[PDB]
Amino acid sequence: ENLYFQGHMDRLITLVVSYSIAFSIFALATMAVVYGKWLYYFEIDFLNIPDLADMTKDEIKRNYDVLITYLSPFYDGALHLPTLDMSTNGRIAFVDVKNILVKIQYVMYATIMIAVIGGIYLLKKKNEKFLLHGSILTIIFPIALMLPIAINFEKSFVLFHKLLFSNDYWVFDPEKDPIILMLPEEFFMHAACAILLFILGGSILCYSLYRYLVKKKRMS
Numbered sequence: 159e160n161l162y163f164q165g166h167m168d169r170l171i172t173l174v175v176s177y178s179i180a181f182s183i184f185a186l187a188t189m190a191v192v193y194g195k196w197l198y199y200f201e202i203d204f205l206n207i208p209d210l211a212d213m214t215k216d217e218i219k220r221n222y223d224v225l226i227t228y229l230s231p232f233y234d235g236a237l238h239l240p241t242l243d244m245s246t247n248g249r250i251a252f253v254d255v256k257n258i259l260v261k262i263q264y265v266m267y268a269t270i271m272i273a274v275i276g277g278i279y280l281l282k283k284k285n286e287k288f289l290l291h292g293s294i295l296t297i298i299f300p301i302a303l304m305l306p307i308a309i310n311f312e313k314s315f316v317l318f319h320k321l322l323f324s325n326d327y328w329v330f331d332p333e334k335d336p337i338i339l340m341l342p343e344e345f346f347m348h349a350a351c352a353i354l355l356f357i358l359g360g361s362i363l364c365y366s367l368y369r370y371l372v373k374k375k376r377m378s
């Protein structure tokens with residue numbers, strides 16, 4: 159009567175743990191790309207942002223450095239671009255973007271702890287499937303968040319937008335928020351591609367860890 163209860167828990171724990179790694183890797187990849195400077199630096203020359211924005215390369219890079227420094231959850235000050243103006247609707251939008259990254263990070267630290275605490279409880283029990291269930295669940299998670307796009311393309315992006323932001327009938331107007339000119343749509347598309355690229359690598363390493371383990375367990 160008891161080992162029927164115990165098996166019902168380790169399958170629940172494997173679920174809670176598997177989902178926790180799926181999200182942990184999603185967050186970790188997101189933060190690697192958002193706070194990463196290699197990709198955007200590459201896009202300055204690739205997308206010819208100096209001529210898009212009528213700004214020098216050094217201009218563009220130091221404004222970007224200040225923005226990424228602002229988006230740290232540990233920078234308590236307001237956003238003060240070195241050479242660019244900014245509407246109050248602009249400042250609001252960047253507080254929205256910053257709020258997500260703090261929300262994501264706080265949940266990430268939560269899933270990281272549950273994933274390894276619950277993960278070692280399972281490994282102490284000679285059980286490895288959370289490393290395999292997780293591995294495939296990390297591939298599935300980031301785009302289950304994209305699933306609404308398949309149902310309706312323009313309308314789904316109206317809820318993604320309003321889930322994030324605090325002003326509905328705003329604008330991208332370069333005369334009032336000229337940092338738009340150095341943040342073209344292609345940059346965000348490539349960045350998201352880097353986010354999943356990182357997630358894909360993440361799924362592999364923890365699938366490798368599943369196979370390295372269970373092959374040394376069956377060896378005995």
Ligand SMILES: CCCCCCCC/C=C\CCCCCCCC(=O)OC[C@H](O)CO
Pocket residue numbers: 169170172173176291295
């Ligand atoms: C007690 C309340 C605590 C709050 C948490 C309750 C949430 C549990 C949800 C359903 C129970 C079913 C438990 C086992 C379900 C099977 C898990 C499963 O679907 O396995 C595939 C997945 O990828 C992972 O392995």
Ligand SMILES: CCCCCCCC/C=C\CCCCCCCC(=O)OC[C@H](O)CO
Pocket residue numbers: 190191192193194195196197200352
């Ligand atoms: C945890 C904090 C301390 C340690 C971290 C320091 C903070 C990182 C800031 C700048 C370096 C960014 C440069 C590295 C960016 C590499 C990853 C990236 O996102 O760009 C690669 C791109 O995907 C391929 O084209």
Ligand SMILES: CCCCCCCC/C=C\CCCCCCCC(=O)OC[C@H](O)CO
Pocket residue numbers: 178179182183186187189190191193194195269270273274
């Ligand atoms: C349980 C799920 C897996 C557990 C994993 C344990 C944590 C591993 C810590 C760092 C690995 C990668 C961290 C990538 C982001 C940290 C660096 C960062 O944010 O700075 C910007 C970055 O340097 C620009 O590339």
Ligand SMILES: CCCCCCCC/C=C\CCCCCCCC(=O)OC[C@H](O)CO
Pocket residue numbers: 191192247248249251252255328329330331335338341346347349350353
């Ligand atoms: C969506 C997946 C992309 C993956 C993440 C890559 C992007 C993260 C790097 C920088 C974000 C900074 C810009 C984020 C958007 C700022 C909002 C904006 O454009 O400002 C509005 C305007 O100023 C007032 O109307």
Ligand SMILES: CCCCCCCC/C=C\CCCCCCCC(=O)OC[C@H](O)CO
Pocket residue numbers: 189193230231263264267268270271
């Ligand atoms: C509910 C919160 C629980 C309390 C919190 C306890 C701390 C989390 C424990 C381990 C994380 C260690 C591995 C994390 C890898 C670091 C990657 C990272 O966090 O980079 C983001 C950074 O802010 C880029 O600017």
Ligand SMILES: CCCCCCCC/C=C\CCCCCCCC(=O)OC[C@H](O)CO
Pocket residue numbers: 188192255258259300330338341342343346350351353354
């Ligand atoms: C594919 C998986 C991707 C993972 C995603 C995780 C969520 C990241 C959350 C916030 C990052 C900042 C989001 C900022 C998005 C703004 C994109 C945009 O198009 O900004 C308008 C720009 O002005 C056009 O020219």
Ligand SMILES: CCCCCCCC/C=C\CCCCCCCC(=O)OC[C@H](O)CO
Pocket residue numbers: 179183186187190191194273274277278356357359360361363364367
């Ligand atoms: C043992 C119990 C613990 C179980 C834990 C499960 C094992 C997860 C393994 C790998 C996940 C790592 C995924 C990391 C993906 C983020 C991509 C990244 O960090 O990029 C590098 C960064 O840019 C550099 O500067």
